[PDB]
Amino acid sequence: AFQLEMVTRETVVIRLFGELDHHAVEQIRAKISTAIFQGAVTTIIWNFERLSFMDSSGVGLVLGRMRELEAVAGRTILLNPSPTMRKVFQFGPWMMDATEEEAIDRVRGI
Questions:
Q1: Which phi and psi angles does 22 have, rounded to 5°?
Q2: DSSP per residue over the chain, as a string?
Q3: What are the residues whose beta carbons fall under 8 Å from the beta carbon of 14, sequence distance 6 or more?
Q4: Whole-angstrom Cα distance, residue 91 to residue 71?
């Protein structure tokens, strides 16, 4: 499952929870890519916390949006990545073990 929620001037939270199917990656890629191309989004906080498993397309889902953000000088934060995830991404975005309010407070500063 997943939820999207505009939470701040151009900032979007993607909560991932449970099992993210290849089909969901697709629903997500649709709404966010649109949002970026529309200029409604320039910062994505991906909340990975509750996630138990995504298939490989989630990895591209995230990296795609990054390449999309790079061009609008946007930014990505990976929030609460487990082991593989942070390893998968390290070998890059910003990873911070925090809450969403925390993550967002942090984004407002800059």
A1: -55, -30
A2: -EEEEEEETTEEEEEEEEEE-HHHHHHHHHHHHHHHHHTS-SEEEEEEEEEEEE-THHHHHHHHHHHHHHHTT-EEEEES--HHHHHHHH---EE----HHHHHHHHH--
A3: 2, 3, 4, 28, 32, 44, 45, 46, 47
A4: 22
CATH number, domain containing residue 94 = 3.30.750.24
| Domain enclosing residue 35, as ranges | 1-110
Resolution in A: 2.7
Total domains, the chain: 1
